[PDB]
Design a protein around this ligand. Sequence first.
Ligand SMILES: Nc1ccc(C(=O)N[C@@H](CCC(=O)O)C(=O)O)cc1
Ligand SMILES: Nc1ccnc(N)n1
Length: 160
Amino acid sequence: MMISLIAALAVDRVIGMENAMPWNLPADLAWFKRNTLNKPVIMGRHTWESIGRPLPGRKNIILSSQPGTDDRVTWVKSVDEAIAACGDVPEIMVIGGGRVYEQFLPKAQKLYLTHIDAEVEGDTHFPDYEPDDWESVFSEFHDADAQNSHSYCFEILERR
Ligand SMILES: Nc1ccc(C(=O)N[C@@H](CCC(=O)O)C(=O)O)cc1
Ligand SMILES: Nc1ccnc(N)n1
């Protein structure tokens, strides 16, 4: 196997811009950690560079056409190699970015989405996912507050 995508989405499915997203959402990061801990995480090189260090308590797998540059994580050159590096686990987590999501979404059975009520002009988007193919099985809404800069709604969808 089961492959899942986990992503934080601004308005219009924006997930990235030139620099870090202009928001502060510790609740989202706690949700991300709770749902990825003890699972392998696959990420593209740009997402790796934006996180800046290995995610603890998870097998970190970086996709890049070029040789690796950090021995604390696993480096792979193809989608199939990334999957192979995960071994036989109950669930593989794909954590970004847009180019990686595009290639893994067809193979995915589960989406963990955080919908953030932030209007951000950004060049990178989460790929189209049709409701015909994806059934919402969990939803939890939260207002912005002293710790979280925008309102956010957690959602899990499973492939119909
Ligand atoms: N695109 C990002 C994804 C994850 C994180 C990150 O720092 N996550 C911590 C969570 C921080 C915490 O709640 O302690 C983790 O998963 O362990 C940062 C950027
Ligand atoms: N991939 C990511 C990064 C941050 N937050 C969530 N929910 N997903």
